Design a protein around this ligand. Sequence first.
Ligand SMILES: *[C@@H]1O[C@H](CO)[C@@H](O)[C@H](O)[C@H]1NC(C)=O
Ligand SMILES: *[C@@H]1O[C@H](CO)[C@@H](O)[C@H](O)[C@H]1NC(C)=O
Lengths: 254, 228, 55, 224
Amino acid sequence: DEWDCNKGTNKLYENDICLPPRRKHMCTKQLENISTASITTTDDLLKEVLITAVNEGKRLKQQWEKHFLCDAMKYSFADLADIIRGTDIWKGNREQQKIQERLVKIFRNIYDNLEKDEYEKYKYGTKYQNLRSAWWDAHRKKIWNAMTCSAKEPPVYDYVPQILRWITEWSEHFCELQEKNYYTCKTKCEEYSKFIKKWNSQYINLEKKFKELDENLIQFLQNVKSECNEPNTVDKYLMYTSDCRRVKFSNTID
Amino acid sequence: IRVFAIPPSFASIFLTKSTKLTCLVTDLTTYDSVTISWTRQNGEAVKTHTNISESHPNATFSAVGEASICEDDWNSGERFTCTVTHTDLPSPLKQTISRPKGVALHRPDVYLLPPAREQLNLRESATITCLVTGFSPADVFVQWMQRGQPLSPEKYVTSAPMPEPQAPGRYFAHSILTVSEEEWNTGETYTCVVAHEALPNRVTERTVDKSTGKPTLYNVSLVMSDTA
Amino acid sequence: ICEDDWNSGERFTCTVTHTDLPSPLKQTISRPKGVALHRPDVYLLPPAREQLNLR
Amino acid sequence: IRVFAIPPSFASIFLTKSTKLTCLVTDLTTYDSVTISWTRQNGEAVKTHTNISESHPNATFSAVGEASICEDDWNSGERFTCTVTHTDLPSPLKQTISRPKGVALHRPDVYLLPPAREQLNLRESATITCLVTGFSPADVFVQWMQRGQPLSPEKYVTSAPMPEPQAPGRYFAHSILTVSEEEWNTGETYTCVVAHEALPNRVTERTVDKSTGKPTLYNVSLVM
Ligand SMILES: *[C@@H]1O[C@H](CO)[C@@H](O)[C@H](O)[C@H]1NC(C)=O
Ligand SMILES: *[C@@H]1O[C@H](CO)[C@@H](O)[C@H](O)[C@H]1NC(C)=O
């Protein structure tokens, strides 16, 4: 349940973001161990993605049995969407570089075996991510159906940029664990002091980069500023289900 | 009334993968019985104006035709005829275009340049420049490719061929592209494809990377002492 | 012929007549279809160290 | 009538160490009273020929023979004659085959090239070349050895000898060994073995791993 927010190799870029634990220890071995020689068509690529979705679903099902499962599975689907779409952040991981190095082969072969009325539309781009996103949006409905076999409508958080979603898992996890914290008192008191200080600077470091309100990140921020009547807020007011903005977060023990 | 016809250049042929011809009429509004046709110098009608362009409201008619089948014949320099005929005009108006001859065909010599250290230190954005130079005909089309895919034409900017002072017949040009600092510290490859008439293969590629410029030796002589 | 005719796949037929042949022999050809496409990946390699020692 | 005799080469006499012969007759009657035998130049009869192939359904005839011979007897120059006689064609046929003699002799120079950095960067597989060159008799057998156990034949190919551009009589060849990139990172030695007559011994061996090719970098010098 540690987020490992120090730089290390968690994120290449110098800005500090705290990686969720759900990103770490995923069953990405199916796409990791792909053979670009044996696969050159869209139909064969869909099946393995469906298999990976099934493995992720059963992994989460086994992990939880060691609505909350639905939320975690929702954000895991969004994370896998970002992995397939090629806009993921975790470039520092040596394992995750190979996946984004060998999906290029598959989608280059797909772009090579295309026809003229789509060749001119998908000719220009960078790292083939335009037709990668097109392929995802074409086959997005089937993947979640295979994922939801373990234990409808297509999820919408997959279009949300990853950093704000990471904020949402942080909010859910912290409210869950502070509910877990409490429900003589001298024995319990000293752990809460260490409970605050293990995550004390975890809130402040991200707040310094909430300014300047990536290329696609800014447009979503501008559009959401027009609605919800709260353009500039350090708290998103999405699924917080508790008090926010430092009200009971810090020094609540006394 | 006036009709202007311009021939396609190497950039249009390379990008469109076909030969497109224009026989465009200026200062002529919409009337009836307007005839435009591109015919062979020998006399036969090689191609008609199928899917004729709609007249522009401001006294302009496009009337473009495609000589797609005869790619080499345009390069041969054979003369083309446009037949413009209207009821008011007694004598049909003709437009003639052909490939020029006699110009020199000196080859380009591209040299791709890595970004400066001062720009890299500020950690904002690196600008890789592609100094195409030496070509005798003034027609160059430059694209940028990353991992076998042409980059969008928004990210790079190409300057027009400028005359070179040292030699009369030769010219030069340049282009830039704004790579992010992260994507260049990662060490990716960028290619500057140049398309020109004088190249025997008619295309040339060059590559740059983070490893393109590095020093070799680091001879250091630490001479720590205690007595001066 | 122009390359645009050949790559479009327009079927062409060959006509040959001879006194020996009671009937003309005709052969047809077109660009093969149904194949797959893949791009080469050139890796230019440098010479071995040992060979340069022989100079 | 067509009677073909295939003399043995280094592949047959060295891969299995048995200088088998063969009588391959083709384009004749499918079913006929067939005589298949080999005869030495002196005239003694060879041993039995077993497992003659059945008639090829395309009206062509097929026959298989084997004649074990002494190894240096084939080198001794004894001309061997395959006997073919049919009732359809009453004329018997005897065809003489012998190894070429008088050809020049030259030693192979095996060089082994490590994979390029870009190929490793693709993170799929590394292909290792084995550049046999400079051998005149235009025959060679190339096999790959990993850690001293034989390697699967499916994991490599070999080109036929082709004339050297700047040598009138010599030849060269090629062989790629598609090793997995992960197996190359955890250092495992691969090596070539070249089979050729002109070597002082039968075979010559060369090997390259990541340790080979790395030059000196750190000239740390301490001065009193
Ligand atoms: C490098 O420095 C050493 C002294 O530290 C000097 O002797 C040597 O000549 C230098 N290298 C070159 C190439 O000049
Ligand atoms: C390494 O240092 C020694 C010290 O004397 C010198 O002689 C030699 O040339 C150096 N070699 C290289 C490759 O720098």
